[PDB]
Design goal:
about 300 residues; homodimer; 3C-like proteinase nsp5 (chains A, B); Diamond Light Source; viral protein; 6-stranded mixed sheet; main proteinase (3clpro) structure, domain 3; binds 2-(6-fluoro-1H-indol-1-yl)-N-(4-methylpyridin-3-yl)acetamide; 7-stranded antiparallel sheet; I04-1; Thrombin, subunit H; alpha+beta; COVID Moonshot
Chain lengths: ~300, ~300
């Protein structure tokens, strides 16, 4: 029993973190096989960020300008290329600590763990969700760029995020491991306001099922609703519309607890309309939306 | 910017996790040097837990009865001893992945990371605090026993907790790495109710300073208070009394933000008396108490 915001064990990712320096800029790189992945803005000075021409800036850079250090040892750079907003630095040595890995581009609402790093060294690990507006609410300071987000299935690490920037509103934007930004963000220091941060309805329901499994049941009521009726409430409270696909993904949780998805939607509807009345659910005084239905099943079953 | 419940990178601890089986019971062990540490209740059957005589149960066990597996390879057990509520299994091979380590017995209010494991395999990592009643609010299922709590200072892992049991109330009890339980708990299946779970006042103040650093300032008011006046409020709301030692530990946060500790106590006092009025602080709708002043400084400065 108990339910926590749990991150994947970070060891497999720690063995991939390196430090990349270009000129006076130092950030984090991800070393997998004989390639180091890092944000392309490593080639910029703070002044360049206002309007950088990355292709032009990269012409003045040679292999010997990218200083790649793994712990206390220096990697030899034998090639460099830009793929979208990431640089790929070919090194002469395959990372001996390279785990089984994949590069995946996640969908909004999906969760992942972040290993925050500075100077190629890990500082901490926490669980995040890709918000519906494609930002992440992380914890990053200057130097954290190149820190990565990932999920783990048994022995395979699926890398989904690489940190690039902080928006003026304190939220975070970044790319997948192919260098494509999530959302409309660009790696430029300009007005990039975020869209509406809606609540991930399917995750709140999954977390409500997690609460029932762990003993927190005060919010269960005598009511039911329909998808269309629930969605009228969800729209009013800036919640994502719930679809039949979401109901289907909640099936195993519905089966385990014996509480039909639409009955749980009616509990959520009353919680939205009436609030928590000074009460808590799984130690939270608000509706948590950064646990997917898969996360709840995983934590509640003990998948390693 | 941003503030998250961050755990230490778990890699150094992942390399120490092993599976220990005795008879029909399997739990986690911690392999450091040529010794495997595990909860002594590994020698019990579920029936034995009602009133176990560990010394008598251990007489029927020989070195060959403790099956210790590290990944897919078997460790040879050349000695066994019981130290308080932990068993120390001497193996013939030093763990090559043994990090620099210490065993520390933490004080209530202190925080630590937990690497939850099942069958010697890690499932996840999360940040915890030793509650003032000596329980921990974790996330553990059957098989998680032997999972450990730790802190990391640069390259040294300080092991502070080993998981032993779940109380009937869903909270968790365990020992330090010398086998001594935190609090009055015993490794017996009996009525062991927990004392008052008070709020760690010094941590709430540290988190309020973290909020100011990250932009959340609505709770700052025009008032001040005294230690004795604040403590009258703290007693009413089951908060730990604030001492001059706590004020002293909050000094660096007070210095960074320019907000005197007693002024922050007056903000906390008004938050206790009036509530949050439907507002949030660092994404929480309640006063968070599982960040120490050291945690706040560490996260806000980027210590790796
Ligand atoms: C300081 C900080 C805190 C947290 N996370 C990241 C950062 N760093 C940055 O944002 C660096 N940086 C500055 C301007 C700019 C423009 C575009 C871009 F891709 C990166 C940019
Ligand atoms: C099932 C579970 C869930 C979460 N964390 C731990 C557990 N396991 C246990 O508590 C095992 N166990 C059962 C009786 C008993 C008595 C004393 C003791 F030290 C261990 C005991």
């Amino acid at each position: 029993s108990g339910f926590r915001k749990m991150a994947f064990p970070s060891g497999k990712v720690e063995g991939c973190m390196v430090q990349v320096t270009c000129g006076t800029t130092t950030l984090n790189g991800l070393w997998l096989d004989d390639v180091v992945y890092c944000p392309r803005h490593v080639i910029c000075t703070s002044e360049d960020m206002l309007n950088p021409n990355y292709e032009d800036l990269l012409i003045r850079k040679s292999n010997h300008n990218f200083l790649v250090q793994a712990g206390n040892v220096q990697l030899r750079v034998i090639g460099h290329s830009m793929q979208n907003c990431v640089l790929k630095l070919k090194v002469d040595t395959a990372n001996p600590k390279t785990p089984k890995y994949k590069f995946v581009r996640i969908q909004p609402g999906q969760t992942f763990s972040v290993l925050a790093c500075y100077n190629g060294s890990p500082s901490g690990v926490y669980q995040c969700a890709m918000r519906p507006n494609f930002t992440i609410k992380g914890s990053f300071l200057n130097g954290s760029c190149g820190s990565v987000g990932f999920n783990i299935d048994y022995d395979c690490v699926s890398f989904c995020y690489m940190h690039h920037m902080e928006l003026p509103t304190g939220v975070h934007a970044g790319t997948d491991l192919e260098g494509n930004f999530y959302g409309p963000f660009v790696d430029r220091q300009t007005a990039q306001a975020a869209g509406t941060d809606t609540t991930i309805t399917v995750n709140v329901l999954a977390w409500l099922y997690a609460a029932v499994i762990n003993g927190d049941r005060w919010f269960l009521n005598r009511f039911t609703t329909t998808l269309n009726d629930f969605n009228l409430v969800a729209m009013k409270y800036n919640y994502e519309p719930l679809t039949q696909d979401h109901v289907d993904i909640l099936g195993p949780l519905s089966a385990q607890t014996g509480i039909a998805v639409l009955d749980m939607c009616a509990s959520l509807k009353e919680l939205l309309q009436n609030g928590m009345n000074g009460r808590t659910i799984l130690g939270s005084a608000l509706l948590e939306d950064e646990f997917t239905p898969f996360d709840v099943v995983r934590q509640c079953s003990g998948v390693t």
